[PDB]
Swiss-Prot record:
Quaternary context: The TCR-CD3 complex is composed of a CD3D/CD3E and a CD3G/CD3E heterodimers that preferentially associate with TCRalpha and TCRbeta, respectively, to form TCRalpha/CD3E/CD3G and TCRbeta/CD3G/CD3E trimers. In turn, the hexamer interacts with CD3Z homodimer to form the TCR-CD3 complex. Alternatively, TCRalpha and TCRbeta can be replaced by TCRgamma and TCRdelta.
Record localization: Membrane
Organism: Mus musculus (Mouse)
Domain Ig-like: 120-177
Name of protein: T-cell surface glycoprotein CD3 gamma chain
Loss of function: phenotype: The absence of CD3G results in a severe reduction in the level of the TCR-CD3 at the cell surface of thymocytes and peripheral T cells. The development of both the TCRalphabeta and TCRgammadelta lineages are affected by the absence of CD3G.
Function in brief: Part of the TCR-CD3 complex present on T-lymphocyte cell surface that plays an essential role in adaptive immune response. When antigen presenting cells (APCs) activate T-cell receptor (TCR), TCR-mediated signals are transmitted across the cell membrane by the CD3 chains CD3D, CD3E, CD3G and CD3Z. All CD3 chains contain immunoreceptor tyrosine-based activation motifs (ITAMs) in their cytoplasmic domain. Upon TCR engagement, these motifs become phosphorylated by Src family protein tyrosine kinases LCK and FYN, resulting in the activation of downstream signaling pathways.
Chain positions carrying an annotated carbohydrate: N149
Disulfide bonds: C129-C170
Extracellular topological segments: 106-186
PTM description: Phosphorylated on Tyr residues after T-cell receptor triggering by LCK in association with CD4/CD8. Phosphorylated also by PKC; leading to the TCR complex down-regulation.
Length: 186
């Protein structure tokens, strides 16, 4: 109802990575990284000083005691010598409460079923979804987006080097996943 309701926001600052969680910084807020979890993180924005894709290639999450519902985001990037360019400016658009949510909409069951590809030999990224479903569909910003190479449980994102970058939601036969934040090297 109240507070922000946007997706995770990533921003690299001086070889550091600053992520923004959609949950106020409570005195019990925690973060997670793929398999390991970062405790004592009572901050809304998680910082990653000296980012390393090799040691930091997976997903991320944020949740609080009162908030047992969190979304799994994909964090994968690289930094070096504070590749500080000019990441500034940030307009303000309309974004206060969305539709379909207060009607007991399905959006809880989501541990780690979705997967994505990146190193397929050529360097192509294939986002997989459906969750063991024989049927899978992907949507972008609330609009369906089909591929030009079929949807064999995967999604055509492009050359990991510079292609995958954005949120993508999927819908399986009886299992629909939330907008996956695929943040790859830019």
């Amino acid at each position: 109802d109240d507070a922000e309701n946007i997706e995770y926001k990533v921003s690299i600052s001086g070889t550091s990575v600053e992520l923004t969680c959609p949950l106020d910084s409570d005195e019990n807020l925690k973060w997670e990284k793929n398999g390991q979890e970062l405790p004592q993180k009572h901050d809304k924005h998680l910082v990653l000083q000296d980012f390393s894709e090799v040691e930091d290639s997976g997903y991320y999450v944020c949740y609080t005691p009162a908030s047992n519902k969190n979304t799994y985001l994909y964090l994968k990037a690289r930094v070096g010598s504070a590749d500080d360019a000019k990441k500034d400016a940030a307009k303000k658009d309309d974004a206060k409460k969305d539709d379909a949510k207060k009607d007991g909409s399905q959006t809880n069951k989501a541990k780690n079923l979705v997967q994505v590809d990146g190193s397929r030999g050529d360097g192509s990224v294939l986002l997989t979804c459906g969750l063991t479903d024989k049927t899978i569909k992907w949507l972008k910003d609330g609009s369906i987006i089909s591929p030009l190479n079929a949807t064999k449980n995967t999604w055509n994102l492009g050359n990991n080097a510079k292609d995958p970058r954005g949120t993508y939601q999927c819908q399986g036969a009886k299992e629909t996943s939330n907008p996956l934040q695929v943040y790859y090297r830019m």
